[PDB]
Swiss-Prot record, chain A:
Gene: degS
Effect seen on changing residue 165 to A: Does not restore RseA degradation in a degS disruption. Loss of RseA degradation
Protein known as: Serine endoprotease DegS
Ranges in a coiled coil: none
Family indicated by similarity: Belongs to the peptidase S1C family.
Main location: membrane
Annotated organism of origin: Escherichia coli (strain K12)
Active site: 60 (charge relay system), 90 (charge relay system), 165 (charge relay system)
Keyword Transmembrane helix belongs to the record: yes
From Swiss-Prot, chain B:
Effect of residue 81 to A: Causes substantial reduction of peptidase activity. Binds activator peptides
Coiled-coil parts of chain: none
Residues noted as binding substrate in the record, renumbered to the chain: 143, 216-221, 294
Subcellular location: Cell inner membrane
Effect annotated for changing residue 142 to A: Loss of peptidase activity. Also affects an interface contact between the PDZ and protease domains
Consequence recorded when altering residue 213 to A: Dramatically increases the basal rate of RseA cleavage
Record text about domains: The PDZ domain probably binds peptides ending with C-terminal Tyr-X-Phe sequences, which activates proteolysis. In the absence of OMP peptides the PDZ domain inhibits peptidase activity.
Designated name of the protein: Serine endoprotease DegS
A GO-annotated cellular component: plasma membrane
Organism: Escherichia coli (strain K12)
Quaternary assembly: Homotrimer.
From Swiss-Prot, chain C:
Gene this chain is encoded by: degS
Protein name listed in UniProt: Serine endoprotease DegS
Active site as annotated: 50 (charge relay system), 80 (charge relay system), 154 (charge relay system)
Variant or mutagenesis effect after changing residue 205 to D: Dramatically increases the basal rate of RseA cleavage
Reactions catalysed according to its record: Acts on substrates that are at least partially unfolded. The cleavage site P1 residue is normally between a pair of hydrophobic residues, such as Val-|-Val
Origin species: Escherichia coli (strain K12)
Regulation: Allosterically activated by the C-terminus of exposed OMP peptides (consensus Tyr-X-Phe-COOH); cleavage only occurs in the presence of peptides. Inhibited when RseB is bound to RseA.
Outcome of gene disruption: Small, slowly growing colonies. 5-fold decrease in basal sigma-E (RpoE) activity, loss of regular growth regulation of sigma-E. No proteolysis of full-length RseA.
Entry GO CC: outer membrane-bounded periplasmic space; plasma membrane
Subunit organization: Homotrimer.
UniProt remark on domains: The PDZ domain probably binds peptides ending with C-terminal Tyr-X-Phe sequences, which activates proteolysis. In the absence of OMP peptides the PDZ domain inhibits peptidase activity.
Length: 284, 296, 294
């Protein structure tokens, strides 16, 4: 046989498209226990989401950093500014100030990820250097390890390790599917990892870039059991034991809270007819 | 503009097969039903016959079965086979059921892409991907001639009794065992019961409340097969076979390997009369033995 | 309608991957086992050195049933490679090899070996990275892969979907439990070392006695950090902190590229070496030695 003319099956195309835009993130801290030497306390990855130099990573990668270093595959190194974070989704946004343009992750807003889709994880596991691993989408809408939390996760069996956090999960076309965030863990679980779906990542990134934080609408309270003191809920004369069937002209069928969360603070909305003005929820 | 291109996917396989893979819940009283174990199962036919692993349903006071579509049933145990670790369940369903695509013509090849479908850690239905790594594996234990398919598709607690399928959604096997022994954390080594073998065991369980195999009362090692032990009052004992004599062939089939022979004896229906050539004192003798059913 | 499959690569390459057994008398007990690859018809086999170290007897078993006693042709601990030789009256399967093929990150690969002595196993993954060190020796230059690798895969093949040899599975990252991080020796390096081992019984390497590292972009070249005492470099008067700009009439652009060039130089050769000391170009003459024994 002669295989010189033949062509090896490969996802190199997806790699050439996406990899240049995935970065190594280093959380550096002053060792105040010793002699203030600068040490890496956490490392992870990030994704360059647009030419202006806005980068997505996990909040847990950059927590407690005294300094955040971003390294590109082309060799460039930057001090990164923390634009904002959001602990509810474990997302964070960084900004780098490169004069020269920079590569961006391919993003197809119309693409719907499907269970069974081939995916590639791109990150800096154990600081070995950028590493590409292959798996499939194993499941969708998972919510992750922690019970509830109102989180929607893609599950994947692409091998994921400390250092992958904040990095890209893409398909065979190089399109961003999600941000790798979490590995499931007497046995040791094999091939169970979680990513924030890209639709959600882009949504939170835009909010963080705009307000420096994620502003969520708040009600202050489907049967009611507790009404927050002096909250938008308490107002409009809402009662303990009160019952609600509709909100903002929608069926009260978790779904309600995701709906209210997007609602801008200041807007007024009828319920049961009690009239409530939505206000900003303070997470701290 | 990748916008008009098509992503590599195994979604097709998932759509065909996944609806037919179920969550199996083992309840044990202590007046309240409590999950003592959980695993997966595959709907084989429209009747509502389901395949799972025995270890999953062992000592279950009540067996609940849950479908991806939302329906929940209480299953009854048709039968279970200790050797192959298989068990069959029955649920009385209305409006019919989804079933696992089966192709008896399909010969699994090493290198074929496969998907494992199951309920790892009760997370919910999970799909993982790998290939067929080998076939005919004895598994973790040399004994038992398991004839497992080996795969590097990720298998975890909760995958037991669940389906392994190819890129066409066709059942390749039943996920059963993971390699966990050294220290060393083994990576990508799991075992499935091949679908052909799994079908046979099922039918024999639906027909009889058990699996009937041929017994010949012999314990031997590997050309010929030495007889280390001769089960007392067994088929071979009655035939007068002695310890330390070499067996050349059984039922007109040469005994090159001990594993293949013990597989052949199981197949022979109890009561069958067969030839058994042996070498004793450098002599050849063809005895006549009557097969009996393998003791409980 | 045919299932997606890499069986072709399996049917092409797997026959040429053998089970390798290292035995010693604690009579003969198996002290280690791994895999190996049949490279050419003459019966030369490649494997890792750490698989066949301190073997009283080396057994090689093929997938077609044949079993041989292997002769140890040579080994090289710097690259952890070793060559076996078996004598077969019948023809031998050989590993498919394409010298022109350039491995790319993202290429689908199969690992073929004998993990835990279960029998020949095939696992699937991709090429995760290239040019990976480890190992400060800087003499291994691994391909990284996520095809499941376990004890027993060592010495076995990493091939692409065409059955073409990509590399020799050598290492598993062990530093929680790391998942999907294994390393293989690239076939180009494997072949180079094989032919050398077969030819000389060992890998004959030139040596200058210097610990050096290229700088980031001042003249470019290799900075001398250490100077092995009584080594060729020390004798010729090279010092720590001078910059090597040329070695044997070739530009010193890359520490790795130069180190590969020094290795090719026959011991005893007297070569020009141009360095930078105090912004002055100096030309020193070193006599190459053979690389020190492990």
């Amino acid at each position: 046989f002669d295989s010189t003319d033949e062509t090896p099956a490969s996802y190199n195309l997806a790699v050439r498209r996406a990899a240049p835009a995935v970065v190594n993130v280093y959380n550096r801290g002053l060792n105040t226990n010793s002699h203030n030497q600068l040490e890496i306390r956490t490392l992870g990855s990030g994704v360059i989401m647009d030419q202006r130099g806005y980068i997505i990573t996990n909040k847990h990668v950059i927590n407690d950093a005294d300094q955040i270093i971003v390294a590109l595959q082309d060799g460039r190194v930057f001090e990164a500014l923390l634009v904002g974070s959001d602990s509810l989704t474990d997302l964070a946004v960084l900004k780098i100030n490169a004069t020269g343009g920079l590569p961006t992750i391919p993003i197809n807003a119309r693409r719907v990820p499907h269970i069974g889709d081939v995916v590639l994880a791109i990150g800096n596991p154990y600081n070995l250097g950028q590493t590409i691993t292959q798996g499939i989408i194993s499941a969708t809408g998972r919510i992750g390890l922690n019970p509830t939390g109102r989180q929607n996760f893609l599950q994947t069996d692409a091998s994921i390790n400390p250092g992958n956090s904040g990095g890209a999960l893409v398909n065979s076309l190089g399109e961003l599917m999600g941000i790798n965030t979490l590995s499931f863990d007497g046995e040791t679980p094999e091939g169970i990892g979680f990513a924030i779906p890209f639709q959600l990542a882009t949504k939170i990134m835009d909010k963080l870039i705009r307000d420096g934080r994620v502003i969520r609408g708040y009600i202050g309270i489907i049967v009611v059991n507790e009404v927050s003191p002096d909250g938008p809920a308490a107002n409009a004369g809402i009662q303990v034991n009160d019952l609600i069937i509709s909100v903002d002209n929608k069926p009260a069928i978790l779904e309600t809270m995701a709906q209210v969360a997007e609602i801008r603070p200041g807007s007024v909305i009828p319920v049961v007819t009690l009239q409530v003005t939505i206000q900003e929820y303070p997470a701290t």
